[PDB]
């Protein structure tokens, strides 16, 4: 089997991407944030504290003839941005782009933090990291990809995120019309439960490429590119007037600037992030200070190849017995 679904930016900055997902019988369609940095499929629901729902579409398990309470199971998750959610668990039928999993754990939120409430466009998350990170207790549950894997034509999914435009998540096949050149594959460590790999270096604009190993994660659920402070300083030094602002929380630059590109290495290959992809617009409405899309990871504990980096490539998440990542230009 295979599946193919369009993913759409939630706003004009590509802050995140939503993909429609069918849950239950008859189908309830919710728009979920596919997150290769976490491993829980959770949704706003009829159980979510009413004051914490503000425009999201909810899953109502009592209206699904295939929903079953997973007795005793609870979940609770906190994300790198400080947001969180928790609740109980149902199993139900879940389909993405024509690909159906029966018995998928659907984690029903009883509570969500303010950032989730305030974003009416995201009805939940669909985690695509490794199932060892799933938070269901006392019986850990599998991701949608892990459950679908055996049925897929090939044990892979691909992320093809658009710049200010829709893109595609495919499951079970590699669309050879979606990229240019060849795909370069690179080793993955699953020791932390992430799609963790080592970039071979970087360049700023037309500058020379610096060969240096940068360990980080491919994370579709993170907006920006978080890299070591040395690398980030080298990038922003090429932008007149750019500075790190503790009050704003990162590097800012004059909105009048033209940003240089940023290149990262995948083995001997190179992925080029155009400068425009690094512009996240005014820090507040009407400001002439703009927020940068490349930021320091020094406060995180890990480097994160988020959407800014991933949307410059066609990305293969290879879930074979020895997982690997593949990157192609497009």
Task: Give 23's contacts (C-beta < 8 A, 6+ positions apart).
Answer: 29, 30, 43, 59, 64, 92, 93, 94, 106
CA–CA gap between residue 300 and residue 238 (Å, rounded): 24
| Lookup: tokens for 179 | 């990229």
The residues that are catalytic are: 35, 199
Q: Which residues contact 247 (CB under 8 A, 6 or more apart)?
A: none
Q: Which residues, 6 or more positions from 287, have their beta carbon under 8 angstroms from its beta carbon?
A: 255
Tell me if 170 sits within 8 A of 2, measured CB to CB.
yes
Residue 138: asked if its preceding bond is cis (omega within 30°), the reply is yes
Which residues lie closer than 8 Å to 280 by C-beta, 6 or more apart?
A: 13, 223, 224, 290, 291, 292, 293
Q: Identify the three-state secondary structure at position 46.
A: coil
Question: Are the C-beta atoms of residues 89 and 100 closer than 8 Å to each other?
Answer: no
DSSP, residue by residue, 286-325: T-SEEEESEEE-TTTSSEEE-HHHHTTSEEEEE-SSS-EE
List alpha helices for 131-237, DSSP H: 144-148, 229-236
**Structure-token pair, residue 266:** 């995948």
In whole angstroms, what is the distance from residue 73 CA to residue 215 CA?
34
Resolution (A): 1.3
Tokens 């999201």 -> residue: 56
- Cis amide linkage into residue 26, ω under 30° from 0: yes
Q: What was the experiment behind these coordinates?
A: X-ray
- Please report the domains of the chain, with CATH numbers, ordered by start residue: 5-174 (2.40.70.10), 175-330 (2.40.70.10)
For tokens 């410059």, the residue is: 312
Residue bearing tokens 């991701």: 143
Q: Which two tokens stand for residue 194?
A: 């992430």
Q: State the DSSP code for 10.
A: S
Q: For residue 145, which of 83, 80, 46, 220 has the smallest C-alpha distance?
A: 220
Burial of 167 (0-12, 13-18, 19+ CB in 10 A): buried
Chain-centre distance of CA 278, in angstroms?
Answer: 17
């Amino acid at each position: 089997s295979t599946g193919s679904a369009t993913t759409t930016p939630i706003d004009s900055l590509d802050d995140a991407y939503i993909t429609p997902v069918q849950i239950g019988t008859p189908a309830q369609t919710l728009n979920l944030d596919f997150d290769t940095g976490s491993s829980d499929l959770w949704v706003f629901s009829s159980e979510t504290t009413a004051s914490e729902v503000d425009g999201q579409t909810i899953y109502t398990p009592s209206k699904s003839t295939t929903a079953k309470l997973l007795s005793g199971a609870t979940w609770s998750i906190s994300y790198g941005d400080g947001s969180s959610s928790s609740g109980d668990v149902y199993t139900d039928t879940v389909s993405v782009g024509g690909l159906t999993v029966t018995g998928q754990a659907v984690e029903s939120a009883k509570k969500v933090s303010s950032s989730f409430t305030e974003d009416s466009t995201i009805d939940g998350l669909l985690g695509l990291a490794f199932s060892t990170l799933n938070t269901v207790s006392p019986t850990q549950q599998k991701t949608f990809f892990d459950n679908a894997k055996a049925s897929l034509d090939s044990p892979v999914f691909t992320a093809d995120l658009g710049y200010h435009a829709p893109g595609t998540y495919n499951f079970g096949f590699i669309d050879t019309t979606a990229y240019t050149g060849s795909i370069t594959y690179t080793a993955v460590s699953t020791k932390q439960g992430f799609w963790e790999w080592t970039s071979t270096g970087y360049a700023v604009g037309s500058g020379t490429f610096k060969s240096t190993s940068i360990d980080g994660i491919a994370d579709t659920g993170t907006t920006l590119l978080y890299l070591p402070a040395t690398v980030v300083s080298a990038y922003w030094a090429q932008v007149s007037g750019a500075k790190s602002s503790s009050s704003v929380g990162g590097y800012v630059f004059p909105c009048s600037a033209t940003l240089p590109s940023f290149t990262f290495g995948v083995g001997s290959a190179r992925i080029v992030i155009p400068g425009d992809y690094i512009d996240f617009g005014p820090i507040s409405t009407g400001s002439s200070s703009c927020f940068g899309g490349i930021q320091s990871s020094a406060g995180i504990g890990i480097n994160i190849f988020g959407d800014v980096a991933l949307k410059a490539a066609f990305v293969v998440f290879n879930g074979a017995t020895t997982p690997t990542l593949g990157f192609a230009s497009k």
